[PDB]
Design a protein around this nucleic acid. Structure first.
Ligand SMILES: [Mg+2]
Ligand SMILES: [Mg+2]
Ligand SMILES: [Mg+2]
Ligand SMILES: [Mg+2]
Lengths: 97, 205, 147
RNA sequence: UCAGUAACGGCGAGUGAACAGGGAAGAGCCCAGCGCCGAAUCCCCGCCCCGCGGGGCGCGGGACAUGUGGCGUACGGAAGACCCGCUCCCCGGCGCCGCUCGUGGGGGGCCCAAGUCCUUCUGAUCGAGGCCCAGCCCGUGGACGGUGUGAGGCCGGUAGCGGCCCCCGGCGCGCGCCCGGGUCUUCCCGGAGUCGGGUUGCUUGGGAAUGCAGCCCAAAGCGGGUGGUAAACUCCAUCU
RNA sequence: GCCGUGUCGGCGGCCCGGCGGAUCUUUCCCGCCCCCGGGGUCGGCGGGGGACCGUCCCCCGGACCGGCGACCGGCCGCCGC
RNA sequence: GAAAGCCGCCGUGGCGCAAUGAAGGUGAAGGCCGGCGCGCUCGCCGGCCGAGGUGGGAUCCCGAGGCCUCUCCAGUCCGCCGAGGGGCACCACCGGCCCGUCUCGCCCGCCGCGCCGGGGAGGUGGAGCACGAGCGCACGUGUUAGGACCCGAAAGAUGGU
RNA sequence: UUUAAAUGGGUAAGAAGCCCGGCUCGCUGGCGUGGAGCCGGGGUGGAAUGCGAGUGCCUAGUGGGCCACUUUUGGUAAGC
RNA sequence: GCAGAAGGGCAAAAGCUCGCUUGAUCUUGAUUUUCAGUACGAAUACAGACCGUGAAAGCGGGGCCUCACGAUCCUUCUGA
């Protein structure tokens, strides 16, 4: 009983399933590249804003720690992914000792 | 400056508009120029057809136009893959290829695949010196004409169905009404709200 | 035709049809729509009421294709097909009702407008109004929906 | 076309794009990176194959270059190894013959028919006349000049008219280059003081900031950008 | 001899007739989908066919006027030779 | 001949054919007949039709009577004709319908029984409906934007000598 | 200001009027009450004088006035 | 005397005292005044609610009547 408005909208056609376009697999980690970036964060180190960040993230609190990364790196959605990868440095330093 | 009952008007002539005027006195002089750009191209090519390659069946976007069929850019890889021809050999056959086009329907996928096999069976190629791989004898008895016109297989051909006559039965003259629009129109907009009240009674204990 | 116009008949008279006193100068009232509140106010009410102010919601980047639906009401409803159909439709063959889809005629919604004739139909449209479906359900017709 | 429309604006005066749709025209590609091949690459000089109108592939020396030239590769995916059934190619140069659709271009010099009889006049190109073949020519009655108004006296104009001289795009002997496609399996897969955020100017229809620029802060990798009302949550779309 | 307008017929020329029609025919004909190498109208798809209706082309009758469409015969009254 | 002609599966598009609301959205046919539900201030089923009514309304229709060389018997006509009838456009009025709001209210519907859908009755807002009139071209007048009927500054800006 | 002119202002001088019969109502209410509405019928000659009216569109110029009887305000008066 | 500037009006009152109150509330139109026959303001007659007062008919949607005030755009609060 097909109709144009509603929750089951539109002319009912059948889907073409296919392997996706190759450019959409663009920022994958590709383990060799994971090796390169992880080899280089121990020859080089951490930025001065993010060494001050993990010295709030171990003792002070986390809500004031994210509000700090909110300001230096731009958005909110970048601030949480930066915060949970600092907490995983802080876990690998402490909890693997 | 105004007067009795008339229109209030915004002519956009407050800018120096006499310098940027474009008067079309050469417009017959250019229509007879780009006829010559077609004629002296059509005999320039070959018995290869005028007006370029073959285009796909393509349905238009944007609800106003989605009921019709247009000629597109290129057939693309998915449709070239099923038809069997190579993606870079296709444009020396005379078939345009648009690799950035997607197929997400199967009805319109098979339409252009049926279109593209129909083309190759009414195509005759010319081997250089007559070895002829995948080609036979004398060229379709000299190919019945020379050069085509404004589209190979009449690329719009917007066609509709017959659907001749039915008898008005019960459950058909009874149900599918205006009310089924208004209820389905309401159920789309009360859908996210009612699934929020459903969470509220699940946290009710 | 500069021959047939007023300035030939008005050539020889001193003020050229503009007055000895007023003596048409350049722009005595202001240029364009000047004074629309101030000294041309009596003109802008009484001939353009409503002309100044906000009235609604702002809608950024509307596209004039999403709200597109042409309408055919029931008086014009039978000219979409041949006149050869409906004379063939009523010749004692059962209740065999012909199809009329307005979507291949370029219409989306079927509205009401009285005197739909006595034959049964099936009407294929994307939308309907409830006056229109109860004219069609009154002549024994059906009202089938399409997306 | 949308459209003087959504929008901007002492919301005053004014300003004001786009997407579908119809057409013109249509054509696509390459690198860095990731690996692979013993730098397999280029420039310059010297004498020569052997040449015209000079450019080289061939020979031996000096450099460039591993801080990375060249080959196969680019996001539509790619590579290697399999297995499977095909296949022998294209490019330029050199001679010469055959054409070029208005019938290839450039230049020169040519190609119809009254100056007949009377008559006017400074002088005619005026005016009148030419058998029942219509006085003559006409694919030539555009024009201009000649003592005045000229199809025929003269340049010309008409014509896939003729003949001349040079220049041009493309068939065939000798160089140079030359294994593609499908299926599966394994491995590879990308551009940073950039994106973005803040604030400050300009600009835009772009409005809780469309674009650009300064200064400050400065990324990620199932990431990033966009989805036209700021934000948090989520799902989907789309692009790279 | 003649053509106009309604009535038709010979379905005549429809298969050696034109066009038009979102009339009809799931028994025709071609490339296919739906189940157990074959099969079921078993519901259709792309294309072609041929019936029907609408209008324009000839044959025989019939209807009127023979209307600025005409010629021949005969009549009247003019005309010139 | 920079003309003219043709296209139609080149009508895409433009304006018109449908209005209303900020918007979500909705979106223009009634009158009679026969019967029934408490014929309940409300309605329901079937048939007939089909844009309601009133008052004016050009024109047209009917028309007793009237008008003609001798009197009773018949014809076409024409003129006059009181009165009567169907009434165009159009105007005034009353009623109806569609959209927005407002008050009062009750019933129905089911791809799912709900902070769901539909309907009613009265009152008001609209540039509506109530059997379509526009579109193209041309000309005229008027208004406007442009140097704008011609001529006129004192000023202002850029860049130079 | 008790009283109160003259000139002046509005209305009326019929058929959209008058009379009679019936019917609707949810308004009104002792009440076949009240009042409107609608339908049906019955009778045209309704002061003088003069004149053919009704309507709709588009619309220019104008937006400095000035004088005289008579009535009046300011001013001593004024071609104020 | 009725708040005041004047005029109108007003006597078991529109004045004075007392008793109860919040109609100085909610809502759609119509009309008048200024007038272009527009708005604002102010006013009139209603109608639909909800209330007051009174034994009651009634009266009351501010002041006995004539003046007592203000668009677009912006902000603010309120309403479903
Ligand atoms: Mg004059
Ligand atoms: Mg004038
Ligand atoms: Mg003037
Ligand atoms: Mg200056």
């Amino acid at each position: 009983y097909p109709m144009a408005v509603g929750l089951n909208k539109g002319h009912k056609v059948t889907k073409n399933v296919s392997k996706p376009r190759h450019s959409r697999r663009r920022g994958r980690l590709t383990k060799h590249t994971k090796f390169v970036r992880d080899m280089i964060r121990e020859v080089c180190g951490f930025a001065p804003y993010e060494r001050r960040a993990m010295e709030l993230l171990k003792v002070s609190k986390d809500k004031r720690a994210l509000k700090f990364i909110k300001k230096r790196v731009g958005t909110h959605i970048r601030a949480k992914r930066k915060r949970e990868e600092l907490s995983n440095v802080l876990a690998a330093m402490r909890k693997a000792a | 400056a105004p007067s009795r009952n008339g229109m209030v008007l915004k002519p956009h002539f407050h800018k120096d508009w006499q310098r940027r005027v474009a008067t079309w006195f050469n417009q017959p002089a250019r229509k007879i120029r780009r006829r010559k750009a077609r004629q002296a191209k059509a005999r320039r090519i070959a018995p290869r057809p005028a007006s370029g390659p073959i285009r796909p069946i393509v349905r238009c976007p944007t609800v106003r136009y989605h009921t019709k069929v247009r000629a597109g850019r290129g057939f693309s890889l998915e449709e070239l893959r099923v038809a069997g021809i190579h993606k870079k050999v296709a444009r020396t056959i005379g078939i345009s290829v648009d690799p950035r086009r997607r197929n997400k329907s199967t009805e319109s996928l098979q339409a252009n695949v049926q279109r593209l096999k129909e083309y190759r069976s009414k195509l005759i190629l010319f081997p250089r010196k007559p070895s002829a791989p995948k080609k036979g004898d004398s060229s379709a008895e000299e190919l019945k004409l020379a050069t085509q016109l404004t589209g190979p297989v009449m690329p719009v051909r917007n066609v509709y169905k017959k659907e001749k006559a039915r008898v008005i039965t019960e459950e058909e003259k009874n149900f599918k009404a205006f009310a089924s629009l208004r209820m389905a129109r309401a159920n789309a907009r009360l859908f996210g709200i009612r699934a929020k009240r459903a969470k509220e009674a699940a946290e009710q204990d | 035709p500069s021959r047939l116009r007023k300035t030939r008949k008005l050539r020889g008279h001193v003020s050229h049809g503009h007055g000895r006193i007023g003596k048409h100068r350049k722009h005595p009232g202001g240029r364009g729509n000047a004074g629309g509140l101030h000294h041309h106010r009596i003109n802008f009410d009484k001939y353009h009421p409503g002309y100044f102010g906000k009235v609604g919601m702002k809608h950024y980047h509307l596209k004039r294709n999403q709200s597109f639906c042409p309408t055919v009401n029931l008086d014009k409803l039978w000219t979409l097909v041949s006149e050869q159909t409906r004379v063939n439709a009523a010749k004692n063959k059962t209740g065999a009702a012909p199809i009329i889809d307005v979507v291949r005629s370029g219409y989306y919604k079927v509205l009401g407008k009285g005197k739909l004739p006595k034959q049964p139909v099936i009407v294929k449209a994307k939308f309907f109004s409830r006056r229109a479906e109860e004219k069609i359900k009154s002549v024994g017709g059906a009202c089938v929906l399409v997306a």
